Amino acid sequence: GDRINTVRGPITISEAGFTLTHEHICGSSAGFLRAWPEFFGSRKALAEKAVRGLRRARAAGVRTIVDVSTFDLGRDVSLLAEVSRAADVHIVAATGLWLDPPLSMRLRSVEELTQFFLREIQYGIEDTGIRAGIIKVATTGKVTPFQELVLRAAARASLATGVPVTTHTAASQRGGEQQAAILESEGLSPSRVCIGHSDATDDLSYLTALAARGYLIGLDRIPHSAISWQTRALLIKALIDQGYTKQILVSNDWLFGISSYVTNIMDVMDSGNPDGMAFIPLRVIPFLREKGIPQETLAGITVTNPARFLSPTLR
Amino acid sequence: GDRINTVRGPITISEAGFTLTHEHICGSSAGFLRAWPEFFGSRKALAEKAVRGLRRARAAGVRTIVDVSTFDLGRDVSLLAEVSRAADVHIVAATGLWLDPPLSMRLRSVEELTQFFLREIQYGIEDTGIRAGIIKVATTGKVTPFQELVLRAAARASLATGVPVTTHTAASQRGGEQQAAILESEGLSPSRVCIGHSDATDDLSYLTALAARGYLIGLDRIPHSAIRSWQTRALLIKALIDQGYTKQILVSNDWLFGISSYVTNIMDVMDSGNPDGMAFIPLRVIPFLREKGIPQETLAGITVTNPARFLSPTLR
Ligand SMILES: C[As](C)(=O)[O-]
Ligand SMILES: C[As](C)(=O)[O-]
Ligand SMILES: [Zn+2]
Ligand SMILES: [Zn+2]
Ligand SMILES: [Zn+2]
Ligand SMILES: [Zn+2]
């Protein structure tokens, strides 16, 4: 109940501390980092940049990140373990599928996909023994037949293991409502689910209604506006004011290299947000305190809500 | 110069022997074999099946295969090296891209794709030091804009290294004609190019015209008609011989020992339809052609001489 899986092994949830629940070391494609590391300068250069960035985040307060990179985002859990250790920042790895499944994933059934997700949660990723601590799913605004299979497999895996589900969403298409209906149709409890990229919208009724059902709300792309970001942050305040503090999760959706986008967008992002993953502790947290948000409510959001979210719970 | 790179290192062209120029150990997707080996039972079970299948081909006279699995077909050159050593069959590895490129590939420029294909030929694949000895390219319909980028990057990598290009085509759409036009626009000699999956048509004049331009003609899915008869497809070999284009013919099975990039259990369907596997060409097509009057010097030219000329890196 009280044990989380990280790339360095099992920890107790009290050690997780302050947690960023939607991040990436590298946004890529399956096999790509190993086949073409010099797209990132080199693998060594990429690991060093992530270590520097994670160390700055740790200085600013962060203890744990959740790397929500799936198989098809090029998750390299060996890289995650190397940089977690050098930075001394906990990293939770993910299973699931994002928006770029290859044929060998697109053609699988819900049962087969369920077995794959259970493999990565219960046995380990590839040949590393590193077990995922969260399931990441991505859908387009209107859920495709394959993405619905992914959703159902995520729910079945989450129910067999208690590990949570976190989603990629088109918030401006109310993407979370269709995901929730599918997930609930599988008997998945909403307190096991986080509707992500939920800060890309003004629709507070959309945001407030999912929280009331028990969903976690991911305001995980605040710094991306800064390429205003306080309008996005003010959604955290708006939700606290409606009484849904136990339902907010905040993050940067940052990364230190990206190949699944046009070339050189990493440098435009870094010179737009020099703070990287430190943006949440350094710029958002004090902005919220300076609107009268109690220090204690923030610790609940940045520490307590992620701990409740990640604890394997058959409930 | 007269050396061909394999997954065990360089070999001289005389070492290649009887060569199957379009084959696969495993038809999969990037990262998939290592993330989900149990899809194939296990990595060990897949390797053992491939060793038996390659040993069966070897006993039917095969000495080399060209594994034309790209990055996005889940090529695992460590697996190819293991099974090559256990079976004593040379395996040439491929660079290039097939029809399932992930986003990190689809968003690259022709200049970036060129660098990737060059790295796999000149430096090595992943961190294994195994260098590709062929560039595989697939297109559909009229070539998509991205596929044209791959075609041009392949031409540029070939022109820099002398390594040949081999293609996946839809022959029923005469897909080789657009491939040839794009490659020739880059300055690539047709003698460096094998237009593959060419047996899946009856349009002999389409094939003859490409051969007349100096393209190699890949007649590589004959066993797939065995579940048109495979003998009908095999007569395209004799037809090209009779027009005097024996030099342009490459024959293969397009077989594999595991496949994840299709519906589950298709491998059982393929194996029961073609129990010969990669031995289909030597055990069935070669005898059939002999019985139709093709002499041994011609069959040895097709299966030994043609692949050696094709694979030997050449800037001429
Ligand atoms: C890898 As993303 C930009 O969908 O969080
Ligand atoms: C079966 As194929 C298109 O990989 O030659
Ligand atoms: Zn996302
Ligand atoms: Zn993300
Ligand atoms: Zn093909
Ligand atoms: Zn093939």
Automatic annotation (TrEMBL), chain B:
<protein>
    <recommendedName>
        <fullName>Parathion hydrolase</fullName>
        <ecNumber>3.1.8.1</ecNumber>
    </recommendedName>
</protein>
<comment type="function">
    <text>Has an unusual substrate specificity for synthetic organophosphate triesters and phosphorofluoridates. All of the phosphate triesters found to be substrates are synthetic compounds. The identity of any naturally occurring substrate for the enzyme is unknown. Has no detectable activity with phosphate monoesters or diesters and no activity as an esterase or protease. It catalyzes the hydrolysis of the insecticide paraoxon at a rate approaching the diffusion limit and thus appears to be optimally evolved for utilizing this synthetic substrate.</text>
</comment>
<feature type="modified residue" description="N6-carboxylysine">
    <location>
        <position position="136"/>
    </location>
</feature>
<dbReference type="InterPro" id="IPR001559">
    <property type="entry name" value="Phosphotriesterase"/>
</dbReference>
<dbReference type="GO" id="GO:0004063">
    <property type="term" value="F:aryldialkylphosphatase activity"/>
</dbReference>
<feature type="binding site">
    <location>
        <position position="168"/>
    </location>
    <ligand>
        <name>Zn(2+) 2</name>
    </ligand>
</feature>
<comment type="subunit">
    <text>Homodimer.</text>
</comment>
<feature type="binding site" description="via carbamate group">
    <location>
        <position position="136"/>
    </location>
    <ligand>
        <name>Zn(2+) 2</name>
    </ligand>
</feature>
<dbReference type="InterPro" id="IPR032466">
    <property type="entry name" value="Metal_Hydrolase"/>
</dbReference>
<keyword id="KW-0378">Hydrolase</keyword>
<dbReference type="Pfam" id="PF02126">
    <property type="entry name" value="PTE"/>
</dbReference>
<dbReference type="GO" id="GO:0005886">
    <property type="term" value="C:plasma membrane"/>
</dbReference>
<feature type="binding site">
    <location>
        <position position="22"/>
    </location>
    <ligand>
        <name>Zn(2+) 1</name>
    </ligand>
</feature>
<dbReference type="InterPro" id="IPR017947">
    <property type="entry name" value="AryldialkylPase_Zn-BS"/>
</dbReference>
<comment type="similarity">
    <text>Belongs to the metallo-dependent hydrolases superfamily. Phosphotriesterase family.</text>
</comment>
<keyword id="KW-0862">Zinc</keyword>
<feature type="binding site">
    <location>
        <position position="24"/>
    </location>
    <ligand>
        <name>Zn(2+) 1</name>
    </ligand>
</feature>
<feature type="binding site">
    <location>
        <position position="197"/>
    </location>
    <ligand>
        <name>Zn(2+) 2</name>
    </ligand>
</feature>
<keyword id="KW-1003">Cell membrane</keyword>
<feature type="binding site" description="via carbamate group">
    <location>
        <position position="136"/>
    </location>
    <ligand>
        <name>Zn(2+) 1</name>
    </ligand>
</feature>
<dbReference type="GO" id="GO:0008270">
    <property type="term" value="F:zinc ion binding"/>
</dbReference>
<keyword id="KW-0479">Metal-binding</keyword>
<feature type="binding site">
    <location>
        <position position="254"/>
    </location>
    <ligand>
        <name>Zn(2+) 1</name>
    </ligand>
</feature>
<keyword id="KW-0472">Membrane</keyword>
<feature type="binding site">
    <location>
        <position position="136"/>
    </location>
    <ligand>
        <name>Zn(2+) 2</name>
    </ligand>
</feature>
<keyword id="KW-0732">Signal</keyword>
<feature type="binding site">
    <location>
        <position position="136"/>
    </location>
    <ligand>
        <name>Zn(2+) 1</name>
    </ligand>
</feature>
